[PDB]
Each structure stands twice: as C-alpha cells, then as structure tokens.
Amino acid sequence: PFTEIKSGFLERRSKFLKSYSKGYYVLTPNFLHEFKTADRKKDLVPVMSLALSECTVTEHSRKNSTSNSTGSDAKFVLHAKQNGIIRRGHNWVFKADSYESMMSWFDNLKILTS
Amino acid sequence: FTEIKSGFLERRSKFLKSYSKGYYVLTPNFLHEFKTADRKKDLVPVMSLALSECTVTEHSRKNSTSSSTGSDAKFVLHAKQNGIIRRGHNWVFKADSYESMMSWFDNLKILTS
Amino acid sequence: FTEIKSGFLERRSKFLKSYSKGYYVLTPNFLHEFKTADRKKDLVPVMSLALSECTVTEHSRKNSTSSPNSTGSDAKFVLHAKQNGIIRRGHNWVFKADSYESMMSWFDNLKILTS
Amino acid sequence: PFTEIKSGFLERRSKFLKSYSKGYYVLTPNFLHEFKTADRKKDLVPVMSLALSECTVTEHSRKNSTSSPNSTGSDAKFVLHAKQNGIIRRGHNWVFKADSYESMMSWFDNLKILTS
C-alpha cells in the first residue's frame, strides 16, 4: 500500500548535456523519489531519493512564459541547501506535462520544504 | 502618484530559459512588478526591486541581432547588494522596441545614479 | 599499439557555442585528439588529455531529448577535470558520439581508465 | 597615414543580451580599437581600445565547427580573454564573429602573435 502526496512523470534537465530525461517521480513528505516506471508493485527501488529537508523550490514558469519550445509554461527549479544528490547551492530544473501539473508539483514542494 | 514610467516588460529567467511578461511600475525607489495593469484591484507587487542598490549596465544597440524578437530591445539590471537579486547578479528585460527600451534604460540610469 | 578505442567524436565549445569533430585515440594514459584519421602522416596530437586526473561523470540516457533537428541527444557524455591541465580543475568537456551505443563504448572505456 | 596591422568589421557578442553587435575594428601592435565606421578620416575616436598587453586569444572555431540552422559564422568565431581589469574584467572573455573562417583565422593569428 504505497502512500504518496503526488506522483507522475517529470522530465529532468541535465545542465551539461543540455537534454531532458523522463522519469517517474513520487513525492512524499520526506523525499522526492525518482523511479524508472509507474509500477509500484515491481519497481521498488528508487533511482534516487532527494531529501526534502534540505531542498527548496525557488522559481517556476508563469502561464505566459515563452521561450520557442515544449513546456515553457511547465518548468520549476529545485535548489539544494546541502550536499547530497545535488551539490550545495546547485539547481535542478524539472518539466511537467502542463502549467497546472507544474503548479501542483511546485505548490506541494513549497509546503513540504517551507 | 510619483510613478515615473509604467508598462509591460518581459523578464528573462536564467534557469527556466524563458521570458515572462509582467506589468512594471517604476517609481523613484523601486521597479515594481505586478501581474496586471489594473491599478485599482491589483495592488500587491509580485516583487519590488530597490533601485538604491541596482545599476543598469548594458543595453541592446540599434543594430543588435539574435536568432527571438526584441534583439534591439533588451537591457540589464545589475544588483549591487543582496535582495531580490543576489549581489553581483543580473536580470535581463525585453521591451517592445528599441525606443521603448531606451526610455526604460534612461529613466533607470538616473534613478540608480 | 596499446590503443583502446579510436574514432570520430564531436566536442562542444562552451564559449563558441558549437561542436567541432575530431579524430580521437584513447590510450591507457590519454585521450588524444588528432585532426585526421591518418595514423601514418598525422602524428602530433592537437591535444592530449591526461586520464589520470579526469573522471567521466554523466552521459545521455537512451530516452534523453534535446530539440527537433538537434543531433545526438542520446549520445553525449561529460569529461570532468580533477586538476588544472588542458581543462581547468572543476571544469567539464562535453562530447557527442554517433549513437547511444557508441557513446556507451566511449563512456565505459573511459570509466575504467579514469578509475 | 593611419597605420594598422589589420582592420575590418567584426560582430561582438554580449553574454547577457545574447545578441551580436557589429563594429569596425582596427588592430595595432598596442590595441584592438573599436570604431563605429570604416572612415579613418572623419571617425577618429575609438568607441573603445583594448590593450593587447593584457589580453590573450584562447580558442577559435574550426573549419568544421557547427552550431545550428540557421546561425551564422559557426566557423568564424574567436575568444579574446582578459588578464587584467580594463575594458573587460580580469578573467572574462569576449566572443567575436568574423565574416568567414579565413578572415577569423587572420584575426586570430595576428592577435596571437601580438599577445604572445
């Protein structure tokens, strides 16, 4: 009986590779977990687990954000306060499947990282 | 009241690689961002940038080219102290034309003196 | 004769925002860049990256995407410098191979050599 | 009687504005000067003068360098690096774009000898 605040697919940007890779993410009160698939029965080991206690969410796309790309209105930034999966003071960019989906991820993360 | 200039500007995000349009009001003390141009009902700035500790550094030349729109209509606001912007960091704004950009720039230059 | 791998790779320039293709030869000590694949006449490396003080950090995933009309979104890897040399300590170089499988050959070989 | 090693138009990139601006450049043994025009008779005051004594040239495009369609001059860029605070902040870099690979290589080669 897996319990979660939110889960869904997100694309995560690589700063150096300048590309996105899609994964299945699970937000709990303690961690943002990345898994390879949505199958909570057979896919049991997170690819990585980001402790929320030492992350913050800092900025997100506006509904009118433009670039010329996909999901210019659906991105948000997760910032590291301490060394872990992410280096202290560094940032990871995520792309959701819509503005409204992004806002749900952002709002939930913001409350869990206050 | 002592508003110096107001209008829509696009502001670049470094991490999101995108522009977002907002309605800005320039006063002697602040550049204020609002969501809308409704001065009666939209009263709380999204953010208020203290001009006392900002400078305007570069701006597009009339011959500036990109490609993206507004290649001749951008300027840079630089922070001298930690606030909305980290000390030493910069924000990029895009106006609707060179002439409009220069109006913003010239006004900001005097206020940040 | 103790070459481990050789072939063409594109290397990204951060300041020039472009890729340049070169012919690379991987040995136990160095990744060498040459202008051409002519091992008889083209004998002097353009540069020689000491593997002893490099690591390979990230690489593209099979599903990595970049942008329509951009090539090799699934074929890049990152070489990181642990010390000042051709690359400044803490800095990174990005390479693009001709496919995911080719990239993974380069990456796996570099991973062992930089251990 | 204006004496120069090389002169010609170059585009200079702005890091923050992500745009290029074209100017007329004059390379002498002492400086890389920027002017607004090619008229050495009426256009007498440099927009800026970069001391070569404290600059280096560090990298340049290859003949095969590729960026994206449609970009121009992917084979015609070079980087000028500051060793001391002046026009450019110490340790910072300016990117220039010439009108061809061969023109770029002429600029780069001359700058490299003058900044050795």
Residue numbers in the entry:
A (entry chain D): 466 to 532, 535 to 581
B (entry chain C): 467 to 533, 536 to 581
C (entry chain A): 467 to 581
D (entry chain B): 466 to 581
Authors' description from the paper:
The results presented here include: (i) the apo structure of Slm1-PH that we resolved at 1.76 Å resolution; (ii) one structure with phosphoserine at 1.68 Å resolution; and (iii) two structures of Slm1-PH in complex with Ins(4)P at 1.4 and 1.8 Å resolution. We previously reported a structure for the apo Slm1-PH (at 2.0 Å) that depicted only part of the non-canonical binding site. As the interactions between the two molecules involve the backbone of β1-β2 and no specific side-chain residue, this probably represents a crystallographic packing artifact. Compared with our previously published structure at 2 Å, our new apo structure clearly visualizes the full β5-β6 loop, which plays a key role in accommodating ligand molecules in the non-canonical binding site (see below). Interestingly for all four structures, much of the binding space in the canonical binding site is occupied by the β5-β6 loop of the neighboring molecule. The long β5-β6 loop occupied part of the space at the canonical binding cavity, making it less available for ligand binding.
